[PDB]
Design a protein around this ligand. Structure first.
Ligand SMILES: COCc1nnc(N)s1
Length: 185
């Protein structure tokens, strides 16, 4: 791919984070804390899952960013509508306003309904996410494997402003404490 030149500087929005997340001072890293992080509750916070949004909102153009997933066992990444549900249980699907992939139990899947099996030969340490708003495209790239394509959502019906979307995953196993990190340009 040749998408690197649409690179954007993404920062995390503390106000949207689940109350157990810890976001770094530079707003570029997030990890699961071992307890409630002593913040007040608000209507923006994801209640049920260890999720957080980027601060940036996109309604046009082409955007590209990269996320470090080194040594994590579980995570979700992609984009979502600014108006996605925050409270209670929900599935990650385009019908619910999410364009995502994930790692779970040693398999990678795209968040279609129902979910789609991904075929990745080289487990990624860094993921590139590309959004073309006008074209209705969200694509994922394996930075560890020379930028190879992972998955493309096409004919996307965004139906609103988009935000970068992150899930650090639970850490029931004691093997998923590592952060998600936004990689430098
Ligand atoms: C000010 O926030 C009001 C709230 N209502 N539901 C929550 N989860 S917190």
């Amino acid at each position: 791919h040749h998408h690197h030149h649409h690179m954007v500087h993404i920062t995390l929005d503390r106000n949207t984070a689940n109350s157990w997340l810890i976001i770094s001072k530079d707003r570029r890293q997030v990890r699961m804390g071992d307890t409630h992080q002593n913040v007040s509750d608000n209507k923006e916070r994801f209640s049920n899952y260890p999720m957080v949004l980027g601060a940036q909102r996109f309604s046009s153009g082409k955007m590209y960013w990269e996320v470090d997933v080194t040594q994590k066992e579980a995570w979700d990444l992609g984009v979502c509508r600014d108006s996605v549900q925050r409270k209670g249980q929900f599935s990650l699907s385009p019908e619910n306003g999410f364009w995502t992939i994930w790692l779970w139990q040693d398999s990678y899947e795209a968040g279609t309904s129902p979910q789609t099996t991904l075929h990745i030969q080289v487990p990624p340490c860094q993921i590139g996410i590309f959004v073309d708003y006008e074209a209705g495209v969200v694509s994922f790239y394996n930075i560890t494997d020379h930028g190879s394509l992972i998955y493309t959502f096409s004919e996307c019906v965004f139906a609103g402003p988009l935000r970068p979307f992150f899930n650090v995953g639970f850490n029931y196993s004691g093997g998923n404490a590592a952060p998600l990190k936004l990689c430098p340009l």
